[PDB]
Design an enzyme around this catalytic site. Structure first.
Site, PDB file in Angstrom:
ATOM      1  N   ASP A 177       7.110 -18.554   7.758  1.00  0.00           N
ATOM      2  CA  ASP A 177       8.584 -19.397   8.067  1.00  0.00           C
ATOM      3  C   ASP A 177       8.083 -20.326   9.261  1.00  0.00           C
ATOM      4  OD1 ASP A 177      10.869 -20.296   8.629  1.00  0.00           O
ATOM      5  OD2 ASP A 177      11.871 -18.639   7.910  1.00  0.00           O
ATOM      6  N   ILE A 233       5.634 -21.919  14.017  1.00  0.00           N
ATOM      7  CA  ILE A 233       5.680 -20.909  13.113  1.00  0.00           C
ATOM      8  C   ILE A 233       6.641 -19.504  13.583  1.00  0.00           C
ATOM      9  CG2 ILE A 233       4.121 -18.629  12.570  1.00  0.00           C
ATOM     10  CD1 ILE A 233       2.059 -20.674  11.960  1.00  0.00           C
ATOM     11  N   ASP A 234       7.509 -19.013  12.753  1.00  0.00           N
ATOM     12  CA  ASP A 234       8.485 -17.972  13.066  1.00  0.00           C
ATOM     13  C   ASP A 234       7.650 -16.552  13.035  1.00  0.00           C
ATOM     14  OD1 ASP A 234      10.486 -16.483  13.832  1.00  0.00           O
ATOM     15  OD2 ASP A 234      12.119 -17.514  12.428  1.00  0.00           O
ATOM     16  N   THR A 235       7.332 -16.123  13.973  1.00  0.00           N
ATOM     17  CA  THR A 235       6.346 -14.830  14.357  1.00  0.00           C
ATOM     18  C   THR A 235       7.262 -13.657  14.362  1.00  0.00           C
ATOM     19  OG1 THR A 235       4.388 -13.921  15.060  1.00  0.00           O
ATOM     20  CG2 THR A 235       6.080 -14.827  16.706  1.00  0.00           C
TER      21      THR A 235
END
Ligand SMILES: Nc1ncnc2c1ncn2[C@@H]1O[C@H](COP(=O)(O)OP(=O)(O)OP(=O)(O)O)[C@@H](O)[C@H]1O
Ligand SMILES: Nc1ncnc2c1ncn2[C@@H]1O[C@H](COP(=O)(O)OP(=O)(O)OP(=O)(O)O)[C@@H](O)[C@H]1O
Ligand SMILES: Nc1ncnc2c1ncn2[C@@H]1O[C@H](COP(=O)(O)OP(=O)(O)O)[C@@H](O)[C@H]1O
Ligand SMILES: [Mg+2]
EC number: 3.6.4.-
Lengths: 379, 224, 231, 379
Positions: free
Chosen positions: C70, C169-171
């Site tokens: 994402d 980046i959605d981690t």
DNA sequence: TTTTTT
């Protein structure tokens, strides 16, 4: 005050870097007490451990200059020497140390307090250490074939088991065992099985260590015995020939002491630790230079009485007087043995034997009544 | 408590000092900030920066801008964006984590071109061959050759020899576990690829790389 | 390695964020349902306002999921720089996962690289202020436990780059029993922003990470060790 | 002027660094003089002694390059060489030196003027240095078993005690001792007890130092006797057979001077200080090539006539001639000797014997009335 | 074999 000094203190107090008696540094990475005299692994340890520090200390462990500074600061704190390989009942693998008192296996920080230097060379996989398995059954069949468990061959069987199981503990052995038997009997089978079982802690050299002096000039065969746990002596020539070299007794007396004296080429260190079980593979009756009571208590002999052959000379094998039973030869055995199909099975069998026999103490006994040369002196 | 709410702050430990962080921002704006004295560790995300445009803006290359810029903090980086019409000026990001050459070493080791063999050597991958040497390491050659497959902002730092030596030193400290070589026995390694034997097809390039063949015949394969 | 593990054509979807656990296990039609690829399209067409949250049906039975990420950058990016940004994003991401798949998963490095850069599916948000999408790698299959372990190295990569896309980046999505909004639906009844497909992929079968179909070009890898020995 | 120069001056004032004759720089850390050639220990001493400096000077002593600058300043002030090991009635330990004239154990600054280089390698534990202890009882029982204190074995026992106790003083001796006895009599047990007692000041070299020329080419066996206080030559081969070289009388006559000649590999140093008490572990009578008055006055021999056996060989040992008493063999003795159980008790016994015998002067006297070869010359 | 190297 200073910031890298605290980092070095944290690296030191966790007891990861140690100093040996010879002047080398041993480090602890990948769950193994590895060390290199040419490539210092201290920087590798620092960069690997950087994850276990507060966030404000990590940023200082990125500059190569700062890691070199930390290494230099660490090197000025190791003042007292530490001796290694003190525990004689621990078998060190590549990814941990397997205990022998109860059969449990440790790894990581647990298998770290025992300063083990040498190792078997291969990782330990607990999933193949089961008791029931087709490999177990085939190996048991092989073992019962090589040494049948008859009432006529009971003491020989248990002596064979004891001699094989003695090749695990790191104590000082006090006897020499002769694997005396005819050709194509299964001695090399046991040798290969043991080599696959224990791996790097097993060397085999020539017969020169038995019919030569051990002081004049270099002796690289002696420096190869440092911290080894099993030594196999094959290709022993016959002695009933002309001018054949005789097995020198003094070598036998000097090969069973806690420290064997001998220097490798281009070196000066003359002391060596003797943790190795010496097994000799002969074919005929061994003859010495002189027989005395000092040689009477350092000799053990096992007998192999099961010949293997193809149906070609089946009747010749069946009629021979030196055998007791003949069976069919196999071809794929040497194929799957080198593929280590019986690696962990033989290891478990050896562990079981060691726990059965030498759990209070370890001691090998002699048996002088097995060779007529030693039956002559019964007077 | 905050532990169950969010594991995030405005300035966590490990970050550089605030004055240093602003200094990095100040070097991106080639011109001089007018209201610099209104910034501190508590309002830099709200106070708009009124830049003085003597030279064209270093971000959008325009002569001047209608509205002041404004900082913002996301994921450990001060993003610089312009208020008003967002499409007039592009986006620039100011990292504040740590060393840059360490990132270069990590991203060069990432592409799997340097390996630690079982015996203790350092094999590399250049010109479609797993060549290696002990007396003369080729790590710097690999760095200079592989600078092509990296983003632009990494090429400017892989030219000065001391930076390449630093990257090599960083790389040598990350290889702690060894890898065995020459697993497939029915393959013939050449100077420009690996030739198969079961079907006669001759692989080359990346496809003929998973076959980690250390040795080579020494000559090239001529399909003609 | 039976037939049922080499395929998963059943889709488990939600209908509202923050569904309580009790409703999930009971599997009441009012909140959760099962679907197929064709039936999902009809449901979206019949409800132009509905909200769906794709998630895994059962964890310990089927952990086989595709690779997905994402991105949410709160700044518009012009077309040429957007193209340049997405080239560096894929090169860095494909390498980083391949290295992890080779060092702690015992898989081959080059097979992973080829399978990722070849065929990937990209979405596109309808919002104009910010740029967000859901990149799903079409031919890289692994267990969810692998993604949980991979969370650490992905976070380190996101904080150690200059490209705006890979830094955003959605981690946090990588957790247990995660949820990914399906393309073509809103987030809440009050929002007006939805995701739209991109060429050349037109089938909706290319945007659900729970759809497992192991073809001749797919690759599989997972951990040999479990999540309890990794202290 | 410079602040680091004042640090170097202060470190030099406390007199912790010395320049030896061989060119090494010995330091004083952890109450024991230490030295090394490949890696100098000056920086280690600087870091260790950091604490004994004023407040403003301690914080300056953490950066490695500043420590290197201080070391460089120090090395430019040591111009005069100082000799070492001038006190022959002291036993240096890892945390001090134990005085022998009155039994006191100095430490710290008191144990510093006695510039001793070699050390035992282990610390001194005053709790276990007491006379009354179960370990002392067991050790006394073992010693009495090995050498019974009867009237027929009085002079032999006194010679045994004197020879064993002579292994503490660091002076030059003038006689060689032959541990003559039959098989399994107690020689190796005594050797191991002494090795555990004194520790590092005990080396075991081969037989090559007795029957081979020690001048041509390197001979590290001679080079390893430098400053050692005890040397053992175990397992002398028999000479009743052919091909065995006789014991060179020149070698024996050259092993009893304060400076023996020999060089290690890759070095030009040819002078070795000789403090060694040479004891030869033999099994048969020794034979020489030349006999004269200069050889018969440098040989002593003590006899072991107590055989330790198992019940199996009880009747065989009882009817033998080389034995005067038969006793039960023990299994744990060889096991727990290596664990250093009777270390401090044996050390106390040795120091008591030393103060009883060699307190005015230390000297050994030959006893040539035991070798038949010299018995012929007693004409 | 060591020395020479390195
Ligand atoms: N863009 C700017 N606008 C206004 N003032 C600035 C700007 N950049 C720097 N300064 C001023 O310059 C000062 C320099 O402080 P800095 O922390 O760099 O000190 P230094 O490294 O010891 O060196 P020096 O003070 O000599 O520059 C800052 O404290 C600030 O007041
Ligand atoms: N006082 C004692 N009490 C009990 N057992 C003893 C005692 N002294 C020696 N032993 C044991 O008796 C044996 C004596 O061995 P010893 O040290 O005499 O051998 P050795 O000198 O190496 O032999 P050889 O001359 O045959 O080479 C050993 O097994 C030892 O443990
Ligand atoms: N128990 C057994 N079952 C099957 N084959 C065996 C067995 N024991 C030995 N062999 C075969 O006999 C062959 C030769 O035996 P070997 O171990 O060389 O005897 P030796 O060591 O006496 O020379 C080997 O190739 C092995 O395959
Ligand atoms: Mg003995």
């Amino acid at each position: 005050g200073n910031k890298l000094f605290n980092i070095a203190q944290r690296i030191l107090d966790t007891n990861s870097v140690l100093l040996t008696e010879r002047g080398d540094h041993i480090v602890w990475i990948n769950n193994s007490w590895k060390f290199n005299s040419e490539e210092p692994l201290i920087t590798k340890l620092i960069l690997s451990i950087r994850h276990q520090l507060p966030k404000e200390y990590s940023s200082e462990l990125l500059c190569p200059r700062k890691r070199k500074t930390v290494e230099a600061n660490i090197r000025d704190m190791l003042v007292d020497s530490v001796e290694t390989d003190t525990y004689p009942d621990k078998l060190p693998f590549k990814n941990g140390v397997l205990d022998l008192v109860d059969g449990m296996f440790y790894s990581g920080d647990d298998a770290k307090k025992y300063t083990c230097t040498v190792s078997t060379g291969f990782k330990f996989d607990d999933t193949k250490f089961v008791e029931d398995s087709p490999e177990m059954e085939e190996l048991m069949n092989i073992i019962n074939d090589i040494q049948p468990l008859t009432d006529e061959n009971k003491k020989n069987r248990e002596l064979y088991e004891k001699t094989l199981s003695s090749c695990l503990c790191g104590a000082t052995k006090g006897c020499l065992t002769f694997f005396f038997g005819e050709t194509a009997t299964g001695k090399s089978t046991t040798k290969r099985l043991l080599k696959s079982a224990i791996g790097d802690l097993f060397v085999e050299t020539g017969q020169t260590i038995l019919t030569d002096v051990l002081d004049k000039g270099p002796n690289p065969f002696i420096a190869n015995m440092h911290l080894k746990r099993s030594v196999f002596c094959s290709e022993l020539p016959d002695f009933a020939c002309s001018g054949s070299k005789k097995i020198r007794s003094d070598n036998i007396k000097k090969l069973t002491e806690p420290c064997v004296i001998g220097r490798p080429c281009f070196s000066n260190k003359i002391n060596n630790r003797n943790h190795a079980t010496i097994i000799i593979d002969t074919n005929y009756k061994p003859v010495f230079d002189r027989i005395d009571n000092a040689l009477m208590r350092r000799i053990a002999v096992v007998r192999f009485r099961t010949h293997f052959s193809q149906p070609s000379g089946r009747e010749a094998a069946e009629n021979n007087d030196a055998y007791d039973k003949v069976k069919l030869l196999d071809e794929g055995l040497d194929g799957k043995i080198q593929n280590n199909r019986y690696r962990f099975a033989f290891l478990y069998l050896l562990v079981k034997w060691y726990k059965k026999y030498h759990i209070p103490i370890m001691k090998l006994y002699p048996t002088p009544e097995e060779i007529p040369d030693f039956a002559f002196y019964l007077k | 408590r905050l532990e169950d709410l969010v594991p995030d702050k405005l300035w966590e430990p490990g970050f550089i000092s605030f004055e240093d962080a602003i200094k990095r921002v100040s070097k991106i704006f080639i011109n001089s900030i007018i209201n610099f004295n209104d910034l501190d560790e508590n309002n830099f995300t709200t106070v708009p920066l009124v830049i003085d445009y003597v030279t064209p803006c270093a971000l959008c290359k325009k002569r001047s801008h209608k509205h002041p810029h404004q900082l913002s903090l996301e994921n450990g980086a001060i993003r610089i964006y312009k208020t008003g019409n967002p499409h007039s000026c592009k986006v620039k990001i100011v990292p504040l984590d740590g060393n840059k050459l360490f990132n270069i070493a990590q991203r060069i080791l990432d592409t799997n071109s340097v390996l630690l063999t079982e015996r203790g050597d350092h094999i590399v991958w250049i010109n479609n061959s797993w060549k290696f040497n002990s007396e003369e390491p080729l790590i710097t050659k690999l760095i200079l050759s592989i600078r092509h497959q990296l983003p632009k902002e990494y090429s400017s730092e892989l030219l000065c020899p001391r930076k390449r030596k630093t990257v090599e030193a960083n790389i040598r400290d990350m290889l702690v576990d060894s890898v065995e070589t020459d697993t497939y026995p029915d393959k013939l390694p050449f100077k420009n690829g690996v030739l198969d034997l079961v079907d006669g097809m001759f692989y080359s390039g990346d496809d003929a790389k998973k076959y980690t063949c250390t040795v080579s015949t020494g000559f090239k394969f001529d399909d003609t | 390695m039976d037939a049922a593990i080499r395929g998963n054509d059943v889709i488990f979807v939600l209908k509202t964020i923050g569904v309580p656990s009790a409703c999930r296990q009971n599997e009441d039609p009012r909140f959760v349902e099962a679907f197929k690829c064709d039936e999902l399209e009809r449901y979206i067409d019949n409800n132009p306002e509905c909200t769906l949250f794709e998630s895994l049906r059962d964890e310990e039975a089927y952990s086989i999921v595709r690779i997905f990420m994402d991105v949410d950058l709160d700044a518009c990016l012009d077309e040429i720089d957007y193209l340049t940004a997405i080239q560096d994003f894929i090169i860095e991401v494909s390498n980083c996962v391949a290295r992890f798949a080779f060092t702690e998963c015992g898989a081959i490095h080059e097979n992973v690289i080829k399978s990722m850069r070849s065929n990937f599916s990209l979405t596109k948000s309808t919002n104009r202020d910010k740029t967000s999408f859901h990149i799903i790698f079409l031919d890289t299959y692994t267990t969810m436990d692998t993604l949980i372990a991979m969370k650490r190295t992905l976070l380190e990569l996101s904080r150690s780059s200059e490209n705006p896309l890979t830094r955003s980046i959605d981690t946090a999505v990588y957790r247990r029993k995660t949820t990914l909004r399906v393309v073509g639906t809103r987030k809440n009844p009050n929002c007006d922003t939805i995701h739209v497909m991109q060429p050349p992929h037109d089938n909706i079968e290319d945007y659900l990470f729970t759809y497992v179909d192991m073809n001749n070009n797919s690759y599989y890898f997972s951990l040999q060790r479990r999540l309890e020995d990794l202290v």
